[PDB]
From a paper:
Human α‐l‐iduronidase (IDUA), which belongs to the GH39 family in the Carbohydrate Active EnZyme (CAZy) classification, hydrolyzes terminal non‐reducing α‐l‐iduronic acid residues in glycoaminoglycans (GAGs), including dermatan sulfate (DS) and heparan sulfate (HS), through a two‐step Koshland double‐displacement mechanism. The active site of the enzyme contains a carboxylic acid/carboxylate pair that acts as an acid/base (Glu188) and a nucleophilic (Glu299) catalyst.
The aziridine nitrogen is displaced by nucleophilic attack of the active site carboxylate to form a trans‐2‐amino ester (with the rest of the R group not visible in the electron density, presumably disordered due to its inherent flexibility; this region of the structure is exposed to the solvent). The carboxylate group of the pseudo‐iduronic acid forms bidentate hydrogen bonds with the main‐chain nitrogen atoms of Gly305 and Trp306, the C4 hydroxyl group forms hydrogen bonds with Arg363 and Asp349, the C3 hydroxyl group interacts with Asp349 and a water molecule, and the C2 hydroxyl group forms hydrogen bonds with Asn181 and the nucleophile Glu299. In the covalent complex between IDUA and 2F‐IdoA, the nucleophile Glu299 is rotated by around 90° compared to the position observed in the complex here with the fragment of 1,8 and the fluoro group at C2 may preclude an interaction with Oϵ2 of Glu299, causing it to rotate. This engendered movement of between 0.2 and 0.4 Å at C5, C4, and C3, 0.5 Å at C2, 0.6 Å at the carbon at the position of the endocyclic oxygen, and 1.1 Å at the pseudo‐anomeric carbon.
Author numbering: 27 to 56, 64 to 101, 107 to 335, 340 to 587, 591 to 642
Amino acid sequence: EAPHLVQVDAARALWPLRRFWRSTGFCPPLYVLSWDQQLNLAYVGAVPHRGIKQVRTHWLLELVTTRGLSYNFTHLDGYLDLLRENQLLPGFELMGSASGHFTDFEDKQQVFEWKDLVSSLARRYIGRYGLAHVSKWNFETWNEPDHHDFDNVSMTMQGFLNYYDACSEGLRAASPALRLGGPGDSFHTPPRSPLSWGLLRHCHDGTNFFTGEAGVRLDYISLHRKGARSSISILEQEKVVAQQIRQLFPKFADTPIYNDEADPLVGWSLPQPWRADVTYAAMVVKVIAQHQNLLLAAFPYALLSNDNAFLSYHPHPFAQRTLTARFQVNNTRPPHVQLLRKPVLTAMGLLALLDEEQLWAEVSQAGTVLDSNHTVGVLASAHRPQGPADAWRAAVLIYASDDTRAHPNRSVAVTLRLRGVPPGPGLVYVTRYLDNGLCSPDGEWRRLGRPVFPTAEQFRRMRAAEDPVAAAPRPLPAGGRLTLRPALRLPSLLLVHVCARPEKPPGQVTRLRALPLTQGQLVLVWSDEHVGSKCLWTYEIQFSQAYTPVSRKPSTFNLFVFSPDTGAVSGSYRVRALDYWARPGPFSDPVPYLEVP
Ligand SMILES: *[C@@H]1O[C@H](CO)[C@@H](O[C@@H]2O[C@H](CO)[C@@H](O[C@@H]3O[C@H](CO)[C@@H](O)[C@H](O)[C@@H]3O)[C@H](O)[C@H]2NC(C)=O)[C@H](O)[C@H]1NC(C)=O
Ligand SMILES: *[C@@H]1O[C@H](CO)[C@@H](O)[C@H](O)[C@H]1NC(C)=O
Ligand SMILES: *[C@@H]1O[C@H](CO)[C@@H](O)[C@H](O)[C@H]1NC(C)=O
Ligand SMILES: *[C@H]1[C@H](N)[C@@H](C(=O)O)[C@@H](O)[C@H](O)[C@H]1O
Ligand SMILES: [Cl-]
């Protein structure tokens, strides 16, 4: 592209910037407690600053069995505990037959039983995690009721309404604070998608199966719309459906709309080279910027989820719609699993640095102003100080993305003119850059000859490309102004982080834990919930076999694979935050690790 001017005015905070994109999801195949999944959700929960919050999970109610009605919740307990351990919430689709029990939602007895199952499970988890926590969950209907083969379950139009009423009453009986929505489907033009449009009319005007009341609770409306490789198309399609909802159903004018399957392209398992690397990452940011700049900044849009928490399959470790790249290394004894962080997951960590107020910004090319429906765009945020562990911040995230198309020839000259940064102590800036040249684990894999079972050393070389290229903190010029002139590739992401120096140093890393990978290798993962500030250079890790630093390139991602040359991993580990002014936080409580022949 021709040169782009990107202006950001830090003195001009316009309105809130809600972090509406912090969701992923997946469908188990016909698993959720496997070691593979345990590693996967550790990667998902390791996005800093709760950058991913929800995991929308299909078939949760196939993790419950019945007797008689009694319910065995053992498997469901295991999955929800695993999300909880990783600071994640279920996108709780009320989806499953309870291992064959439910077959017909026009059978009155089954409808009552469904309500009891939903009451029972809700009360259980309110008891297990607390009401405050469970009230944050998006309980949702069965996935895509108009595009699903219900098979051994009979789910008619009326059945779906009966089912819904049982979901709603089941949750109500447990607590009125619990949230329910649906249908989680595309809303094709009537007379298509009868169960989806039918749900809305039923909730607007229909009769409640249990109470006879006119209308039924619907806390949010969830749709699914994908891009067919176009980013802007997602937004376009959402607006058409939201307008039809608004016109047909006056009561839903302020009802929140979710797009909880908002992917570039339908079909997660289809190999696509652009899914492997920064191409997918930059498009995801582009879609988000489009939503903030062209919609939210007036339909009541509240949530966007990229449905990309699936585990990839041989022979396509990198090329599927996944946050991680899975390698089932079958030539070791015993065989083991390794995951790599793909650029899309790393990108969610850059988005996570965006703060609560949107700053004025303008992108232009030779004086023509361009909105986010273009290949180059920006999201800029500012943060107002909380306490003494906090201070003023600005985060500027620039994308260069031609959707699913990557051209190795293609670059863009950007001039970033940041002004209006308020006076503050120890002002510094840090840049983080991602492109396919420097930061593609898939690139490194292909350069090594695409080994199906990479060696330990080969895995090290691939992982070295996971993190962005980071420039050390530099002091900001006086007058609160900064001009940068980066060359950006297409695709690429550039985050410019400007921080004032908090009075106190970082807080403590917590919930350190170690997941075994194989002999001589483990994953360390931790929480940043008490660290306080986002102005972090790295997490210093120490190992006592006393304590010595594990030297590594800077990384703010809350997970590290330890794979020393020696295979000596027995001992204890501890982790602490290091800020932009070289001040450490307190070390986490340490975690022991013992390999036993
Ligand atoms: C290493 O061992 C594992 C055994 O766990 C092998 O995993 C299996 O890999 C195949 C893919 O080559 C998977 O089959 C695929 O399933 C999907 C979804 O149903 C389907 O779309 C594909 O066409 C294909 O049938 C299979 O699910 C998977 N099984 C498990 C339990 O993970 C892996 O292939 C072995 N690696 C090598 C190189 O032999
Ligand atoms: C519940 O299911 C689990 C695992 O599937 C099993 O270990 C447990 O014994 C079951 N409890 C029953 C049948 O009461
Ligand atoms: C985005 O730009 C294209 C032309 O490049 C235009 O046809 C489309 O309508 C635009 N969409 C929006 C929502 O601005
Ligand atoms: C939505 C979608 N049809 C699927 C896909 O695109 O692969 C997947 O994202 C999800 O499991 C479906 O509900
Ligand atoms: Cl996709």
